[PDB]
Every structure is written in C-alpha cells, then in structure tokens.
Amino acid sequence: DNCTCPTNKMTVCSPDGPGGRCQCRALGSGMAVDCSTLTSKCLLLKARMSAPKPSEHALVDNDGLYDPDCDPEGRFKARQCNQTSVCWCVNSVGVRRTDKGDLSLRCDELVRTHHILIDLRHRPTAGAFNHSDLDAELRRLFRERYRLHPKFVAAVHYEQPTIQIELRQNTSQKAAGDVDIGDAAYYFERDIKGESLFQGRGGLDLRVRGEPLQVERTLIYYLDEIPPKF
Amino acid sequence: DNCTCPTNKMTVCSPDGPGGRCQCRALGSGMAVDCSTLTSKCLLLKARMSAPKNARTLVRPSEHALVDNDGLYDPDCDPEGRFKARQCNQTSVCWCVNSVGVRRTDKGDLSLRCDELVRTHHILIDLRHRPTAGAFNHSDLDAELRRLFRERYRLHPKFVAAVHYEQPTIQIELRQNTSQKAAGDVDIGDAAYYFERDIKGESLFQGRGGLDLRVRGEPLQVERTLIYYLDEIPPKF
Amino acid sequence: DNCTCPTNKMTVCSPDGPGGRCQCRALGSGMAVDCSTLTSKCLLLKARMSAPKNARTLVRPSEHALVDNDGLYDPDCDPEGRFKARQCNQTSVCWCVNSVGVRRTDKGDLSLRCDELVRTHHILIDLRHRPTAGAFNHSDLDAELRRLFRERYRLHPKFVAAVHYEQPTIQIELRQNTSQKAAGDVDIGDAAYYFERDIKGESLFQGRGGLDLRVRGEPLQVERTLIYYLDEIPPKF
Amino acid sequence: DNCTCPTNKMTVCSPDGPGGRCQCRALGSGMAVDCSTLTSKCLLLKARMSAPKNARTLVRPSEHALVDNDGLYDPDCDPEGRFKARQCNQTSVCWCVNSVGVRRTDKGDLSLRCDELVRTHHILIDLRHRPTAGAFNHSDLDAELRRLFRERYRLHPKFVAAVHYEQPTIQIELRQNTSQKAAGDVDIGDAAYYFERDIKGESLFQGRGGLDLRVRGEPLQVERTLIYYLDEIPPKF
Fold it and tell me: Disulfide bonds, which pairs (chains B, C, D)?
C-alpha cells in the first residue's frame, strides 16, 4: 500500500498500475524487478552506469566498473564488450576471465563463480570481539538481511582485526530462487561502504553484542568453477 | 486482488511482492511492463519468439527451418523498450531499423554504425474484408475505425490522419511526427501492432482473442492485411 | 445437395452446368477445385491476393515505403495447383520457393532459374494456449489433435510425426517426404494452412466455419502460433 | 599523549619509543609515515594488500581468485614513498607505471627496464551524485570542493585546475607539473587517491569513515566515480 521497492533503491516505482497497483522498473536496465529479494548484480551495475549523456582523454582507473549486457534472467552475459571492439568473457560475478579480444570473441558458457572470500578489516578496539558472537551475528546478517540460505555461508574466521566470510555455492546446489552468493556479496559491499541498496532500511549498523563494528578495509576474491585463461 | 496485465497478455505476474504486491514482467524480454497502457512493439516481438526456458519434451526449430515472414525476428530493446537502432541476429550480420523495427538499410557486418533510430511517422494499414452482398457506408466505417484506435488502442484521435473506403479494400492512415508526441502518447507503431495482432486473431489483450469489428451491427471479417511504414528519413538501399 | 464447396469457401458455385449441374470455380485463380479435399495453399493465397482494380479513392502507399505483408503475396501456381518453383512479384524481382511457398534463395532478377520445386517435408507447428488453472491430460490432447487433422483436414495419420505437450506451448510435428506421398494424399503444407486459418478464426470451410477445438470438453484457445518449415534441401542464402 | 596517526589509519603506532615516544609505521610496508600530511599512494596500496603475517586460522585467496579491479596490486615503493617506475607482480611479468600507479605500457618480461617515473600532471575526477529534486548552484559547489581539497587533503589551491558541474555530474580537474611541485607540497596523485577513498567509504582518516560533502547544508552522496590520469609523456601501447 506504498509504492516503494525495499530490496532495490535503484528503481522507479509509481502507482500507475491498474487500480493503483505499484508499478516499478529497474533504473538503467529497464528490467522488471522483484522487490522481495536481491536484484542481480548485473542489473545493479546497469543502474550505476546509467550514462545519461565535458570530456577528456587520458589513462583511467574505474574500479572495474562498466555498463554490462544482462540476459533476460538478469545475470551477466558470458561475452561482455564495453568499448566497440574490445570484448571478453566474464563469470557470474561479471569480472573479466580472459584476455580482452576482438568482436569475433567466442564465449560459450557463463562460468559460475562458486566461492567468494570477503576479507574485512575492522577499526581495532581495546577488547576484541567474542568469536562466537561475531560469527553468530554475521550469519544472521546474511540470512536475514540478504536472504541467503545458511547452507551457503561456508565459514566465518576471526583473528585480530581482519574478519573473513567464506561463501560457497556450486551450481549443483543452487535451486529455484535461491539468492546468489554473487548478489549477497554485492549487497554486503555496498552496505559496508555506506551505499546500501535498500529503500527504507538504509544503513548497515553492524554492531556485535551492542559494540559497533566499523569496517576500514574490504577485499573480495571470486573463485570460479573453472580457472581463468590469461 | 488479482494479478492481471490486461494490456499485455504476454507477461508473467504473481502476488510475490512486498506485502503481496503484484509483480509482473514481460515474457521473454524479462523487462518491466506498464499494465495500464500498450507495451512497446519491441518488448512484444521479444515475447513472441521467446525460446521456452527448458523445452523438456519439446523440439527446437531447425537451424535451416524458415518461417512465412522473413521480417519476424527476436529484437534487442533499449531500456525505454523501443527498438535499438542496430539489430544483429545472425553471427556476423547486422542492420539498422526504424522505430517500428523493420529494416532500413543493407545488411552488414559487426562494424556497422546506426547513428539514430529513424522515426516511422506515417503508417498505412490496407485491409480487405470477405465480401458481403454489398458494401457499407464509408461514414459508419470511418466512425468505427476511428472509435477503435480511440478507445481500444488508446491512440489520441488526432493521430488517425484519414480513413478511406471503396469496394471491399479498406485503408487507415496514421500520422505521428516526433514533434507531436507528448508525454506518454502511445506511439502509432504500437497502436498499429496491437491492431494487426488483433486483425489476425493473436490479440494481446487479456480478455480478447481477436477483433470483433462490427460496423452498424454487420460483422467485418478481414481476409488480407498490408501495413506500409513511411520513415522521416528514406531507407538507404 | 446445394451448390456448396465445403472444403473451400473461397469459390463461386452455381448450378449453371449441364442439366443444372453444380459448377464451382476458385476465386482469384480461376482454377478448378476439388470440393471433397483441401485446396492447394497456392490457390488459396491467390484467392486472398485478388487485388481488385480501378482503385478510385484509395491511396497508393508510397514510393519510399517499407512493407509488412506477413510474407503473403500473390503466387503463380502450376496447372496442378502447386507453387511454381520460380516466383516474381511486382515486377522484375524474383526468387525460388519451396512446396509451401516461402522464399528459399536470395532475391534475384528476371534471369533467375529455379531448378526444381524443393519439397517441404517437415512442418513444426508451435502453438501457445491461454493458460488455464492447470494443464490438460496429454493423452486427451494428443488424441484430439490427431483426430482433428485426420477427420477435419483429411490428412493421413501416418504423417503426424509427433504431438508434444508441456505447460502452455503445444507442438505438432508433421513429416511428409516426396518418397512417401501417394496419389491424392493431401499435403502437410496444405493441412497446415487450413489449420492456421482455422486457428486464427478465418476458417476456410464453407459450412462448418468453426474450430471448436475442445479437449475433454474444456476449450483450447490459442494465443500464439509459429509454423516452421524444413525443406528436403537447405536454403541458399 | 595519545598514539594516533590521523592522516593515515592504515598504520600501527605504540608508545614504545625513547621516553614513551609514539612510534608509528605503515601497514604492509613497514615504512615511516608522516602523520601530519598525506601518505603516498604507493604506501597505501601496499597496506591494502597487507596479507597479515600469520593467518593462523585465516585462509589466503587462491592463486586463481580474481577481484573487481584488475588494476589493484601490491606495488614496490622507492625509499621516498612514490612508486617504483617498474612494477612486476607475477613470477615473470613486469611493466612500467606513472606517478599514480597505473600500467602505462605493454606487459613485458624480467629484462624489461623503465628509464624514468613518468609524472601524472593532470587528473580528471568525474563524480555522479544521487539525484535530488533539482540541481545545486555551481558557485557553492566549487566554493567547497576547493575548500575541501585545501584543508582536509592539504593540497595547495593553485593545483585545483577547475570545478565543473553538469546534469548530475561534477568534473574536478587537478594540475601539478614537476616544475610547480615544491618540497612538502602534497602530490595531486596522493590527494586524488585520498579523495576517492573518502568518496567510496574507505576513508583513510582516523576519525572519519567516509566523506560528508555538504554543499550549503544538503549532503552530497555519490553513486559513481571515474578518475582519468594524464601523463606528461603519452602511453606507449
């Protein structure tokens, strides 16, 4: 009864559907969105890279960001070109998994990313956190906030400052509508850097047993079912 | 209440959104759809061919099989839902299209550049109806055809240039420059598509299957159909 | 009975023959017609494509217009009623067709030579029907589509290769090589056409005129129909 | 009084020095750090890649894992803190880099030499901010992005070439030639880097976690960032 899209703020909803039914479409892609679970990373990248329309010419760092082509199911397309003739292949996370080729390039399958290492560093505290609670609370987080099944958070390590979350999802084990670790990860990263994609609960508090857990560095490593070809 | 997309049957809805909210998406395209007005031709062409996901007793049309309509094809649509100016389907064959999606140029290679999406501004729909003992009154035809675009196809009555009528063969002119298209005016390309799809009994409306098309009580059954598209820029062949 | 051609409505019958005999000629072709079985597609296309003359009020579409003719055209038909292997419309542009009449070669000039009438031996009819609450009993469906082509379109059961079924989309495979078609075996390409025309509500039968198309009582309404044509020799493009 | 390195949080202090003297050192490099001005970019990359000494429950990213950013790496930094003009990471893969860190030549082998540290004299900072009902006033924005670089990133005014503003977009240009960079003048490369890290929520300053960016009171959040580096010598690809 309120034309909002909680799970994806990168969208335009307006109650112009039959009877006031809230219609809501993805920003940049134009695709339909499901405001009950996570939106695919590919369509969220399409939003980031809207590209409405002064110039320069240089060398450039972009953080690996670009406007991808996403299939009807909203995942990445195996082949991915951004400039005119530079093309390559990507994994389910849409990172480059080959040497940039030419417009003839042949990518034959979307190689699944099945393991993701999230290494977080946290603002050191006088008293480090209880491993038990830190684990318990990170597992809750992925379960409740990112709607990821507990069976896909493989492990949660904890030493002084650096924290690590391992995610495992083979293709053999992802069923209908299971949220992808690819996307759970991305929602986490956005949250961590304070750009939460959630339209209404915006903000990652992330406090363990009351004490807040500020994160200072974040690195994410994608392991694919097939090793890249460089 | 009930998940319907009454302006585009070629969709998939369900009450699976926030607090039961009816979500609904475009078959094949996977794109978002406005269930309160017409859907862009492109989003509907994508839905037509549509490659069912797991065929699973089914068979796929052969590499060498061919259909009655050369021009039929699975297009690529931009985020606004209109045809991308350039349309490659074959491995290394590209072309440019107009706003209505038909081919404007000689087929090409993957280096091709289509600079703008040339606008189709005039459309000519050339129906022929299975004869009755006589003809009808042109008056009643113009009235009815203009009423259909006006109510059913939600096309502002200013964009029906003319209706012509002779022994049997009927004609409907549509005119819409890009200057005269306001916010959310339905396109004539879209209205025309909906019309033909209905004329040929693959209606895209929820409750309907075809076009009734009765004039002053007498039903009007349509044997032939021809739809000529005129572009602002003439096609380079 | 009465001067009626039950298998082809696109005709004029009158009892102007010897001793009030019923003579009946085919509209647009002028060809004879066998009112006991299906007429050839080529002759039915000719009927649809009359294109009457003298065009008083009607507008001539454009010099610079693109055509959406659904592949339809006025074909030339050999004295037996099959498609001429060489087809040229509107003048001076030609191509070769197959037994079903679709283009099989790149368009050509008035020197083009079409060796033979390459046969269409496999027809895939992909249907899609109005989703019900559930599905139908596959058995009953396959039984009723087999019965339909057998009784209605007078096609021999041995030519309906398969009948597949899933959620909504329904497929019907027909296979008739040249090596296996006898004298007065109705063609698959013709039964196909008769099917499509009935599917899209423009029945060709003079006196039934209705595809009830119900399976175990529940009616089967068809939302989308694609027909794929596989030739005994691949096309040359 | 309190062991704190406000200008670089990626370090380790302690009062283990002469008479309790606070001693502090950059993570991952073990280099000395000026806790009053910016630390060099090279020294920061080094600390991003720290790989803590013994994991000892932790795991190490595989030899095959990749990251989002192909140009993140662990650089070698000269004893002054700037990048070594030649960088290998792989077993047998070396290239050359600019004053800011990015590969400016083809990827060579272990007998590849690089014969100067090619300066980066002009940087383009492109930012897109999250939409608001309307724009800002270009007089306020420039008044602040110049005040921000001035005080926080401790960069001398005369090096902010320009501040632009288009539809959401904010161009910031930075110029610093070798001939204008005096001693203890913070490099632009190291102000540009500190900026992005704040823009993108990995701020390097002790107190802060991100960048507040309130122009006249309205907070400026930033969905997209693009940074373009121009080198005095053009890159030999």
Answer: 42-77, 88-94, 96-114
